[PDB]
Design a protein around this ligand. Structure first.
Ligand SMILES: [N+]
Ligand SMILES: [N+]
Ligand SMILES: [N+]
Lengths: 10, 238, 8
């Protein structure tokens, strides 16, 4: 994936 | 951790693994021991976490495979989110876990030191991002806690690399111009630790970045010095 | 021990 800036999260 | 290498038992005694028990048990986030009942992590880690009953904090863990159904863990009594947090990319990505029980300190689990607010003048030259996350986009959780060394970059250069986002002073960026070494899925909330005068300081909290280790796109971390006062307000409550 | 102290 929704947000390329949250690939290092979840 | 992309491009990182395995750590050894006791190397990062403050790194902890933050697990959730719903619907399944799963590693969720890195975190840092900052005191005998306090874990410093990222607020984003708790989107979709409605009760601290489903959190397990695991300390002294080198290998994710160490955790089985009878392994000790620290219960999370309370979650403290910074009241101005909304998104990782919008700053204020900081959070405290007040644990139900005291933490004993040993070679495997030890607190890390916050920066001194009189030491923002410091340019750290020995910084490491650590975690059990992917070494690869679309990967799996790594078994052995990984480490990678990365140079801090100015907020000026981090801003130049991140048009469209405001890089506030309460953020701090780190990465190699060419990429290759960075945090990635699972490492968020973990520390960016920096050795200075033989003393480790918790300089940043992994929080966001464009993809992972992409060149000319450093990682963004909550700049911990800018919240020390905030931390104390929560950890010295009367 | 350490410069920024956290209460137990
Ligand atoms: N996603
Ligand atoms: N080991
Ligand atoms: N700023």
């Amino acid at each position: 994936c929704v947000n390329i800036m949250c690939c290092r999260c979840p | 951790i992309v491009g990182g290498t395995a750590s050894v038992r006791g190397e990062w005694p403050w790194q902890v693994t933050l697990h959730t028990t719903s619907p399944t048990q799963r590693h969720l986030c890195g975190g840092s021991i900052i005191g005998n009942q306090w874990i410093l992590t990222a607020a984003h880690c708790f989107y979709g976490v409605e009760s601290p009953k489903i959190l397990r904090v695991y300390s002294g863990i080198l290998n994710q495979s160490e955790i089985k159904e009878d392994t000790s863990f620290f219960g999370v009594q309370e979650i403290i989110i910074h009241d101005q947090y909304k998104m990782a990319e919008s700053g204020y990505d900081i959070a405290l876990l007040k644990l139900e029980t005291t933490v004993g300190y040993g070679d495997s689990q030890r607190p890390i030191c916050l920066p001194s607010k009189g030491d923002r003048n410091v340019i750290y030259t020995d910084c490491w991002v650590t975690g059990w996350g992917y070494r690869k986009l679309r990967d799996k959780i790594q078994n052995t806690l990984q480490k990678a060394k990365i140079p801090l970059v100015t907020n000026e250069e981090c801003q130049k690399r991140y048009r469209g986002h405001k890089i506030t002073h309460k953020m701090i960026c780190a990465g190699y111009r060419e990429g290759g070494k960075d945090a990635c899925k699972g490492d968020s909330g973990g520390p960016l630790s920096c050795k200075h005068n033989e003393v480790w300081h918790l300089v940043g909290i992994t929080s966001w970045g464009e993809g992972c280790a992409q060149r000319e796109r450093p990682g963004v971390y909550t700049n911990v010095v800018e919240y020390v006062d905030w931390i104390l307000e929560k950890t010295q409550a009367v």
